[PDB]
Amino acid sequence: EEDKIKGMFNPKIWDKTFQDGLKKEIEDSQPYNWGTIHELVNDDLLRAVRKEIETEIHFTKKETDIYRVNQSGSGLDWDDLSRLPNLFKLRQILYSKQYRDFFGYVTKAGKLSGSKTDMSINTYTKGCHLLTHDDVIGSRRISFILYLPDPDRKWKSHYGGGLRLFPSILPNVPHSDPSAKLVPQFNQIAFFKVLPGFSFHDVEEVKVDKHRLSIQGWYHIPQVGEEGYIPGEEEAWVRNNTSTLAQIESNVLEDFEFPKDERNILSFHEVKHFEKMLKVKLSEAEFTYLSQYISPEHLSSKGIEKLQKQFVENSSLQIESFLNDDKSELLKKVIKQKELEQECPYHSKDVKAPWKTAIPPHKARYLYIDGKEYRNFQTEADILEALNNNDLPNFQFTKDAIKIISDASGNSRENNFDAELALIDLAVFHKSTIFKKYLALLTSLCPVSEQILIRRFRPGMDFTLATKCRFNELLKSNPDIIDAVLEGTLCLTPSAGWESGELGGYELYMMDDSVLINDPPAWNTFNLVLRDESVLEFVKYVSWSAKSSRWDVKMKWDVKSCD
């Protein structure tokens, strides 16, 4: 009762002057309303809870596209906490009427469910992380995290594990870079009211070899019977954030994704060449042209049949030493040089031509070169300007634009476009008619469209999430054109240590064990995959631990059978 529960918290939290001060502070916070309280719970109680958890619970590593976490979601039954009396106590006081009134008041959330408790316990160790998300699930009204690292030592900034908040360009379109970061200590709580479209946050990777324990939880909309229940409130809420969010997603939101998952159609000269060949396959002039980039191993009569058969068998190809030695060395030299001697931008504002940042961060983040005009999305107007003035990729005009920049600034070991120029030449090569003629030979498919990107995934920044291919809307009715996207990836990652996947950066292909391909970055490999609409793909978040970025060239084609 009352006094027994209030005694388990810092006495300050029951003080009206403190409460008003805190409500004001949360009201003035940026980038959206959040709060923090130091030394929330009674020290002894919380020390005990930490002891119980270290002693009573096992934590297993779990990796998805969006997180690596040691969870207990093996020891933990929320309906039987008999062996963990201290935790049971914490859960009772955190959901008590006294605390729910306090918490609802300072966050301006209104009333909170007493019965519907929702907690999980996690540890973050080196490499653990949670990417950008907003917490909008079901009936959640407030998010909190209570932190329990070592009570007798300061958790430092460079340890990582910070709670990071994101400012917003529009509703549902957060900025790529965070504008606030909380470095939490023991017995500190962080919390915010859930804001569909705004409450974007993540957990910064833990960077050093330590264990950060925490209790994550949510307060829910009052349920039927409880204080502050309103009939139809929860269902209105859930409806709005689900079926109708999906409705706004297709109608509007996909427009604010960059790069767009769209392909440009090939000319009739190209398509005719492919067709004729499919219904003395390549000329000598053509092998000569191909041999400038491609290893003779894959251009030989037997290399081809081998690849043809693998593709017919698996609907996929994983080639090694794809490029020849002349190109492999040049690319390795210029890429290593850039990695070791030049500064990589670590903020979207610092990214310059020919590079761009993929957005938004709750879908993806990475640097890419698309051959389009320079774009740096810092405001709504920046975005609308692009959507009004869409342009087409021109890799040659990008080499040109590099020279105007290179000649008005000079060149040096610290600032040059050698890597960019080499990679664009690679891109031009893969856009040539003769390359696609070679692709058509390997696969017996006839490409009818293409998109090429050069991508760089920075350590500690960059990642995609699991998604399906996007069918060319306009072509869906053409029965000759296969219900599939052919997808290529040329990995050009020069550094070592990827093999176990612990550093991230792996390309993952899976069924909606369902894993079809799981390739950590390597040097000069080429994956070709013909995806149906059910196949999911992503590149995993690259860890701060990694010695270089993942560099690749990404290619997509719409295809038709010539029978």
Binding-site residue positions:
133, 135, 147, 201, 212
Helix-helix angle 268-278:433-443, to 10 degrees: 30
Stretch of residues binding Fe ion (CB under 5 A), selected from 86-94, 132-140, 345-353, 477-485: 132-140
247 scored as a contact of its own copies (CB under 8 A): no
Instruction: Report the binding-site residues for Fe cation.
Output: 133, 135, 201
352 scored as a contact of its own copies (CB under 8 A): no
Quote the strand ranges of 65-188, DSSP E.
67-71, 119-124, 129-133, 140-147, 163-165, 168-170, 173-174, 180-182
233 scored as a contact of Fe ion (CB under 5 A): no
135 scored as a contact of Fe ion (CB under 5 A): yes
Q: From the CB of 350, what's the least distance to its own copies, in Å? A: 22
402 scored as a contact of its own copies (CB under 8 A): no
Measure the CA–CA gap between 107 and 26, rounded to whole angstroms. 7
Q: Smallest Cα–Cα separation from 526: which of 554, 549, 505, 502?
A: 554
Measure the CA–CA gap between 187 and 46, rounded to whole angstroms. 7
Residue 272 binding partner per list its own copies, Fe ion, none, with a CB distance cut-off of 5 to 8 Å that depends on partner kind: its own copies
Residue 135 binding partner per list Fe ion, its own copies, none, with a CB distance cut-off of 5 to 8 Å that depends on partner kind: Fe ion
Q: From the CB of 293, what's the least distance to its own copies, in Å? A: 13
339 scored as a contact of Fe ion (CB under 5 A): no
Q: Smallest Cα–Cα separation from 463: which of 335, 363, 556?
A: 363
394 scored as a contact of its own copies (CB under 8 A): yes
133 scored as a contact of its own copies (CB under 8 A): no
Angstrom distances, CA of residue 194 to CA of 43, 133, 224: 28, 11, 21
Quote the strand ranges of 448-561, DSSP E.
449-457, 463-464, 481-492, 507-510, 515-519, 523-531, 536-539, 550-561
Instruction: Report the binding-site residues for 2-oxoglutarate.
Output: 147, 212
Q: Smallest Cα–Cα separation from 6: which of 104, 89, 93, 77?
A: 93
Stretch of residues binding Fe ion (CB under 5 A), selected from 93-101, 134-142, 452-460, 518-526: 134-142
Among 23, 116, 133, 260, binds its own copies (CB under 8 A): 260
Show Cβ contacts of residue 280 under 8 Å, excluding neighbours closer than 6 positions: none
Burial class (CB in 10 A: 0-12, 13-18, 19+), 452: buried
Stretch of residues binding its own copies (CB under 8 A), selected from 93-101, 109-117, 228-236, 250-258: 250-258
Residue 478 binding partner per list Fe ion, its own copies, none, with a CB distance cut-off of 5 to 8 Å that depends on partner kind: its own copies
Measure the CA–CA gap between 559 and 541, rounded to whole angstroms. 30
Among 94, 434, 553, 555, binds its own copies (CB under 8 A): 434
Among 433, 444, 467, 545, binds its own copies (CB under 8 A): 433
Beta bridge partners of 181: 164
388 scored as a contact of its own copies (CB under 8 A): yes
Burial class (CB in 10 A: 0-12, 13-18, 19+), 387: exposed
Residues contributing to the site for its own copies (CB under 8 A): 251, 254-255, 260, 262, 264-272, 289, 372-373, 387-398, 400-401, 403-404, 428, 431-434, 448, 473-475, 477-481
Residues contributing to the site for Fe ion (CB under 5 A): 135
